[PDB]
Design a protein around this ligand. Structure first.
Ligand SMILES: [K+]
Ligand SMILES: [K+]
Ligand SMILES: [K+]
Ligand SMILES: [K+]
Lengths: 283, 283, 283, 283
């Protein structure tokens, strides 16, 4: 499937904009298989527990959705999980504790097993932001658990994807790395949860379809066509993503201060986005 | 000066223990120049905003104290700062935003200038945990600000300490790295805010005194004597620190789950701690 | 194509074994499209200029071959290039200078342009060993040069492969990373120069063929089947490669002292190799 | 002591200049306790075995000197060691094998023990260039050996220096990091083998003397005064070092191509060097 990690709107002063959040979700959901709320591009860690709960209550997804859970401890995680469950989330996408990760030890397994005991979840490996590893050994140890559905791997390290493919069964792999999308698919990924899918959801869907149908030549051409979009967006992060959505007329809002309202890569990104839009691949 | 980053007590289930927190602070404060509440060893990021405020309200320091502020955004930082100010904190020890740090840009300066506009603060560089850098260029740009008192550098990279010494005036440098303490002092540090000072506060004070008084030979011998304690504690992190304090009879509590109640380094640390205790250097 | 980086045989005392080198090359060449002499798995840097020239003179490839050139300066590179040219090498596979790489600057381009002026070459990016980067910006600047045929990328970072595919024409991409082989092919690689091809050359050829012919399902199954072999070999490096070849009866010799004659991963590798051999995929 | 790692002169075309090498050594040796030939700043790895032997034969040190030995294998190391011994070198400064370091294992100890069996040596830890680690565990295992005199540590990681000081006896520690010199001295270093000593040998000697004599305030002021020189030189590397020596009229020659004849940091370095020269601290 193709799911986008929708951003969480804030006005210029940094106030959570619930109305915008709901409108944004409704404008994108029809174009994709489902939504990922509070993913790595969703600024979940920029919200207090109160805002976190408030933001999710403002949404009303019509399709099965995922909720990212990024906490440092089980006590802090408990509320996030209860909120996600009450919202009707299909599963959680949980990252490993970060700050004291070096002292975690076997606590990593204890963390995921505790959460999996209460709700289905996908392991969330996005080191570019969390800056901590999720050893393949740990993934293999957790893979047998009925409630550990699979993993969203945003690292862009396809050696990991190849590993899941060769050694893990009953384990659904989702890549969060747009630039190597076709490569991940070749290596067994079920699909992609891509920030770029917020902009060209139909294009990534088409790429996935070409691959599934064996139209390799067509898949490669689309992969090459989408490379610049995915590559630049990865470099621009949240500020670029939100600026792009605002440019297209969607209520994505702005990154929470002190982060910049505009991306230094806008000048380079604009023509790339407009080009795809002219081709009919945007939204 | 010598200040210890006091841990924040949780019972085995992970519940904040306000009573223990207050008792712990009262048992250590007399032995040091002041306390650092919610420092990197204080598990501040393991608390919700509500627990954070509750924990600080439970304390009643008699000496000027510092409060660590580790948030990702200004909106989240505002409450933490107001709470610290109301508690009578002498200054904040603030770390840079982490999760989306790569997209921060000049927002780093905006972050600190916003906080410094409301309260005096020390820059907090502890990359081992925050996993993000605080460029010397940024430190030099912030150094002129009247409310940016100085910096606590826990990196153990004395090239940075040497830099502050040679290029920055009106900038108070505190090292948070125990194993190279004497080296930092030689390179101009005003003192140390060390986790090891929770265990042997009088020893680090003596080392500082020897250096200040020019008793270099005595300083080197004490530095060598304290090396094992500081080295092992750094490897053991919060779990080792709390287990050591509990062993000495203080109400340090336990790390918040999923972190381990006991450290894998205890067997190696025990004799080191007991040895210093027998010499009369503990608490 | 499929080319193996043949190892350079040394007896147990570390003496170059020319006879073994020639016999080894003759035993493998028929099974592949060509050979890579002195590749990263060939211990070229373990030879003196004299041994380097002697070793190559001992070979008599019947198929177009490549010669790896790993030097720190142009003066040192000159002899290596002249030797390769006199041997009839189709092209060089040159790595960037290493030791003072941080001070190289634009000298990187000067290095490759100087070599390309005298002989056709492939850029050699194998950071795991050279421990230095080869910026995509530099690759793009060098790509237009008629004598810079392409690049062998052993990094396993498929974002780079995707980049070459989307932005570079007249640029032949070879991956040196076995575990993600199918992923690289999906992302445009012309083929692979794999250490694992020294053991199962026909298998990697079959995988390449399946992909080229659009037999994706068959390609994925073979990719999964070969994953353990490629993954373990990458971890075992040269010692494991040579021990495996010796086990199969080929005169691969031993790593030059102080490197170990046997790999710590042999016990885990043995059954993997024997399994593929029983299936008929070895040599 | 204070020893400078003298550069090895090459003309603009990259030809080894034996005459210049000898003149350079004679111009610096009187100002220092001894010389380090083929140190990390000496471009030893930029020479073929023949040039290496030729270069050393051209020198005639009057004071006890050290010779750097940077090879990948024992067979390659043998000649370098024999040459150094025949030249009358007091000891070797050997780095660990690099290219296949990950597969070295216990071969690291075998390497040093083999060399130490034939000649006295200092371990050489300069990761910025070799890009490989030399575990403290390995240093401690090698420390008891009679012919392993000590270690030159250029890492700038004073935690390592503190370790040697607290745990190792009969082990002479030399720091190769100028910016933290006073810090290293405080932590027990016997002295420094600094590239900056090629320019201001008397200044670093004075700093060492101040520390040894307990004149801490004077030591700190000199440490601060020399910081800019050492900091910039470290950033400029060999090209900056040679350009500085040429500027002062010494026959340092140029870096071997493709490295730049001039450093991009010259404009910033010039005033720093001239300033120290005007103060009377240069050569
Ligand atoms: K499962
Ligand atoms: K200030
Ligand atoms: K070309
Ligand atoms: K010794």
């Amino acid at each position: 499937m193709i799911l986008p990690p929708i951003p969480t709107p804030f006005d210029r002063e940094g106030r959570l904009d619930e109305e915008a959040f709901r409108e944004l979700a409704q404008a994108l959901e029809p174009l994709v298989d489902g939504l990922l709320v509070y993913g790595s591009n969703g600024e979940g860690v920029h919200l207090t527990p109160e805002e976190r709960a408030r933001g999710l209550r403002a949404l009303r997804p019509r399709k099965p959705f995922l909720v990212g859970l990024m906490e440092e401890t089980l006590p802090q995680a408990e509320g996030a999980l209860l909120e996600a469950k009450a919202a009707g989330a299909m599963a959680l996408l949980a990252t490993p504790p970060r700050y004291y990760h070096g002292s975690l030890g076997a606590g990593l397994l204890r963390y995921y097993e505790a959460l999996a005991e209460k709700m289905p979840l996908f392991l969330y490996h996005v080191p570019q932001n969390t800056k901590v590893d999720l050893p393949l050994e740990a993934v293999e140890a957790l893979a047998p658990h009925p409630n550990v559905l699979g993993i969203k791997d945003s690292s862009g390290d396809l050696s990991r994807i190849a590993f899941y493919q060769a050694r893990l069964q009953e384990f659904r792999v989702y890549t969060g790395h747009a630039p190597t999308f076709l490569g991940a698919l070749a290596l067994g990924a079920e699909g992609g949860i891509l920030a770029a899918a917020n902009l060209a959801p139909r294009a990534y869907r088409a790429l996935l379809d070409h691959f599934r149908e064996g139209r390799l030549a067509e898949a490669q051409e689309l992969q090459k066509k989408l490379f610049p979009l995915g590559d630049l967006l990865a470099k621009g992060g949240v500020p670029l993503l939100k600026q792009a959505l605002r440019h297209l007329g969607l209520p994505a809002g702005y990154p929470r201060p002190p982060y910049p309202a505009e991306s230094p890569l806008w000048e380079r990104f604009l023509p790339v986005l407009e080009g795809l839009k002219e081709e009919g691949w945007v939204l």
